Design a protein around this nucleic acid. Structure first.
Ligand SMILES: [Zn+2]
Ligand SMILES: [Zn+2]
Length: 309
DNA sequence: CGCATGACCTTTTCGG
DNA sequence: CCGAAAAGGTCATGCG
């Protein structure tokens, strides 16, 4: 009772996955004809042993997800040759963003200082980072599709994107015009307070924040960008195509929105600057590790090394 | 009817 | 040789 698609009896691998003779036949025939199917719902129909033959579109979407391989189906020179060969979404994305950041009408200025004038300051740095991990995982689990993924792939997607997200969010909620950094827990510090912990990295962060805010990005669009930062292809994914199909929903989600209220980009034109910002982060953690004066805890060390392939 | 379905067939290769 | 794995081939059956 082993079939990755419909859960029927499976006694072999066909086109890459453990599959029943049925889902084998369906996949073969689909690809041989280039056939395209029409969902009469949300593109999420139930597909199990009895219901499989109803929404054809949704069966062939689940086939593709668990890892079945269009390429294995033979054509051209290998046609008819048998045997082994010789060798709303947008609303949820916004809700998830809003429930995970603090009420801007009630921040905390208890520590703020526009002219501050040591191991304690480096500790408070690690605390702001460890604080954001619980919350950014919270955010991720509320992206539609993410908690349906394999627990392995969730953990991989989170560790790969944690630093890219802590920065991107910090950059979108802070007030750079007044040198003001606002964290997830609503604390407020001036760049010059932060320099003790972040290093000169912070100056690079405030510059990004300037650029990003000077594009006046509405919350619906930011809400999608943050999703595309996390839900992306990575080495180690047990089920890539699932992650690929989800990324693809979110993109078309973002397109539909821009070709509506904003008329018929420049942001992704500095999505490379974000990756460069993050390496600058890693340089800082390496410095603190190697100084061995107050050492980053394992979990920090791990998740800064993990913003490379 | 004409067409999808799927249980069960034959074909190919490998390695002991 | 001959079995294991996994490609396409062959229809009888069910559907609308
Ligand atoms: Zn199946
Ligand atoms: Zn469907």
């Amino acid at each position: 009772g082993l079939c990755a698609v419909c859960g029927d009896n499976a006694a072999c691998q066909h086109y890459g996955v453990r599959t029943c003779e049925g889902c084998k036949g369906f996949f073969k025939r689909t690809v041989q004809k280039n056939a395209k199917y029409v969902c009469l719902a949300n593109k999420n129909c139930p597909v199990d042993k009895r219901r499989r033959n109803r929404c054809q579109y949704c069966r062939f979407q689940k086939c593709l997800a668990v890892g079945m391989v269009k390429e294995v189906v033979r054509t051209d020179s290998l046609k008819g040759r048998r045997g082994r060969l010789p060798s709303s979404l947008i609303s949820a994305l916004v809700r998830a963003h809003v429930d995970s950041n603090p009420a801007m009408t009630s921040l905390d200025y208890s520590r703020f200082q526009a002219n501050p004038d040591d191991t304690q300051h480096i500790q408070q740095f690690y605390d702001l980072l460890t604080g954001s991990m619980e919350i950014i995982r919270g955010w991720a689990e509320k992206i539609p599709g993410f908690a349906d993924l394999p627990k392995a792939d969730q953990d991989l997607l989170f560790e790969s994107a944690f630093l890219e997200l802590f920065v991107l969010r910090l950059a979108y909620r802070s007030n750079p015009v007044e040198g003001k950094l606002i964290f997830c827990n609503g604390v407020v510090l001036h760049r010059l307070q932060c320099v003790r912990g972040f290093g000169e990295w912070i100056d690079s962060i405030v510059e990004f924040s300037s650029n990003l805010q000077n594009m006046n990005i509405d919350i619906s669009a930011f809400s999608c960008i943050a999703a595309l930062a996390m839900v992306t292809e990575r080495h180690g994914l047990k089920e890539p195509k699932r992650v690929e199909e989800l990324q693809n929903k979110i993109v078309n989600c973002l397109k539909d929105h821009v070709t509506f209220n904003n008329g018929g980009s420049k942001l992704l034109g500095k999505l490379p600057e974000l990756r460069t910002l993050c390496t600058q982060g890693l340089q800082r953690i390496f410095y603190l590790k190697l100084e061995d004066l107050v050492p980053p805890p394992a979990i920090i060390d791990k998740l800064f090394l993990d913003t490379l392939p």
